[PDB]
């Protein structure tokens, strides 16, 4: 029982981090002269939970 | 005699003024395109910093 639950929670963590990796590689990918660039509303906002290192 | 001297001096003045005017006009035009590029780059960086919230 213990092993099955541990494996599933690790699975969740893994999918989360790989999604993050997708987002960040896109962030590096884009640049200027790009159809998606514009002014967005007050993005200087700090997040609510704001996990630390 | 003194009149004609004055006349020559004035023409010298006007010619130099003309050339300075042309050079300044060119410089100003350059400055406007500097403005435009500044705003473009700000747009890009704004988007970048926004996107991480996902």
From Swiss-Prot, chain A:
TM region positions: none
Domain of life: Eukaryota
Location(s) in or outside the cell: Cytoplasm, Cytoskeleton, Cilium axoneme; Cytoplasm, Cytoskeleton, Flagellum axoneme; Cytoplasm, Cytoskeleton, Microtubule organizing center
Tissue: Expressed in the testes (at protein level).
UniProt modification remark: Ubiquitinated, leading to its degradation. Deubiquitinated by USP16, promoting its stability. Tyrosine phosphorylated.
Family to which the UniProt record says this protein belongs: Belongs to the tektin family.
Record's subunit section: Microtubule inner protein component of sperm flagellar doublet microtubules. May interact with CCDC172.
Function according to Swiss-Prot or TrEMBL: Microtubule inner protein (MIP) part of the dynein-decorated doublet microtubules (DMTs) in cilia and flagellar axoneme. Plays a key role in the assembly or attachment of the inner dynein arm to microtubules in sperm flagella and tracheal cilia. Forms filamentous polymers in the walls of ciliary and flagellar microtubules.
Stated name of the protein: Tektin-2
Organism name: Mus musculus
Biological classification of the source: Eukaryota, Metazoa, Chordata, Craniata, Vertebrata
Part of the whole protein covered: 163 to 215 of 430
């Amino acid at each position: 029982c213990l092993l099955q639950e541990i494996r599933q929670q690790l699975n969740s963590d893994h999918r989360d981090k790989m999604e993050t990796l997708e987002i960040d590689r896109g962030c590096l990918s884009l640049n200027l002269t790009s159809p998606n660039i514009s002014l967005k509303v007050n993005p200087t906002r700090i997040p609510k939970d704001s996990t630390t290192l | 005699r003194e009149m004609e001297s004055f006349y020559s001096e004035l023409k010298w003045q006007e010619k130099n003024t003309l050339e300075e005017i042309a050079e300044l006009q060119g410089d100003i035009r350059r400055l406007e395109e500097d403005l435009r590029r500044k705003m473009m780059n700000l747009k890009l960086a704004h988007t970048r910093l926004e996107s991480r919230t996902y």
